Amino acid sequence: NAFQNKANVCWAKSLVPILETAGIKLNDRQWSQIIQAFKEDKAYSPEVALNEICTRMYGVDLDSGLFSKPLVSVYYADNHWDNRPGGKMFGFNPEAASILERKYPFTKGKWNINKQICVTTRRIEDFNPTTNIIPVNRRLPHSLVAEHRPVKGERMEWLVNKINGHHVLLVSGYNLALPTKRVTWVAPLGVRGADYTYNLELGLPATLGRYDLVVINIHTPFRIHHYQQCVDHAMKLQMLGGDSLRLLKPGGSLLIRAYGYADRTSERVICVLGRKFRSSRALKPPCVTSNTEMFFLFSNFDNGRRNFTTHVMNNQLNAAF
Numbered sequence: 001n002a003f004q005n006k007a008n009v010c011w012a013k014s015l016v017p018i019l020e021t022a023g024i025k026l027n028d029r030q031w032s033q034i035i036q037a038f039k040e041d042k043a044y045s046p047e048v049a050l051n052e053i054c055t056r057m058y059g060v061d062l063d064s065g066l067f068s069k070p071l072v073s074v075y076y077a078d079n080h081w082d083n084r085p086g087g088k089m090f091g092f093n094p095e096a097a098s099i100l101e102r103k104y105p106f107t108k109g110k111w112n113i114n115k116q117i118c119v120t121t122r123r124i125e126d127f128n129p130t131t132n133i134i135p136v137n138r139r140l141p142h143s144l145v146a147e148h149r150p151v152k153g154e155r156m157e158w159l160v161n162k163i164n165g166h167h168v169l170l171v172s173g174y175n176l177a178l179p180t181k182r183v184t185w186v187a188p189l190g191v192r193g194a195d196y197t198y199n200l201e202l203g204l205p206a207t208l209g210r211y212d213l214v215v216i217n218i219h220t221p222f223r224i225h226h227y228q229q230c231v232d233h234a235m236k237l238q239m240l241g242g243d244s245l246r247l248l249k250p251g252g253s254l255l256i257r258a259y260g261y262a263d264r265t266s267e268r269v270i271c272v273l274g275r276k277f278r279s280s281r282a283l284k285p286p287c288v289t290s291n292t293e294m295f296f297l298f299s300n301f302d303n304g305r306r307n308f309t310t311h312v313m314n315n316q317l318n319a320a321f
């Protein structure tokens with residue numbers, strides 16, 4: 001409602017009109033609890049945020065079609081979101097709501113009263129921070145862990161030294177000892193000792209050049225459930241993962257620390273990234289730091305548009321989790 005003391009939530013203000021079509025009115029507290037990026041006042045994407053809000057408020061994600069009706073546009077330009085025409089359009093979809101009412105009769109006529117709808121424990125009350133964590137409509141691409149658990153393992157070097165590619169770009173909050181490599185370390189603003197510091201909430205600048213191996217090594221704190229960690233990490237996949245493509249030499253590889261792709265946003269990013277490499281793997285090396293952690297390894301970059309399904313990564317991550 002207020003957006004008091006928030007300088008980077010232009011994306012959130014762009015969702016207000018879209019939420020209105022659904023009858024949803026979020027205040028500052030509710031914005032913060034749902035989306036970590038809002039709480040920390042960080043750059044973000046309206047569609048991505050709308051997915052989290054749809055999941056929490058309705059118990060289902062955007063793939064239910066609840067907001068697929070073109071009523072309000074979200075326009076992106078010059079690192080800024082607003083509501084000019086000519087952008088992706090969203091809006092509450094009564095047709096989609098009707099379909100949902102088949103499986104969940106108790107929801108009928110309760111969509112647009114600014115109330116949270118939980119079919120699990122059939123309740124209709126004001127927003128509850130612990131309600132509707134995981135979307136009921138979405139079939140998870142791979143197993144998640146039931147309880148988060150810290151894990152002490154080996155260093156990163158033993159995974160990185162095995163990956164082909166001499167010239168390495170390291171995007172991390174801390175440095176790694178990679179002797180066999182020629183490393184260029186990029187860190188967030190404020191970090192000392194790195195070759196370059198940038199605001200990683202704006203992605204990576206293509207002026208960094210192209211490398212044989214790009215290692216994205218940014219952690220995302222655990223919150224609530226394994227699925228939620230994937231959610232909280234998705235934007236990073238989009239931002240740092242996508243921008244890395246302009247920083248890859250022909251035949252280059254991309255290593256990304258992640259936690260899978262349990263959510264819709266994450267799986268999208270992976271599919272997009274996969275089409276650009278000769279192979280794609282989901283790794284759970286001994287150098288993981290937690291129960292939910294893993295690594296994406298995209299090999300041999302040719303900037304192409306090949307066929308890519310997550311069926312093979314789905315089996316790899318089922319064994320990991």
Ligand code: NA
Pocket residue numbers: 048049051052230231232234235263265
């Ligand atoms: Na997300």
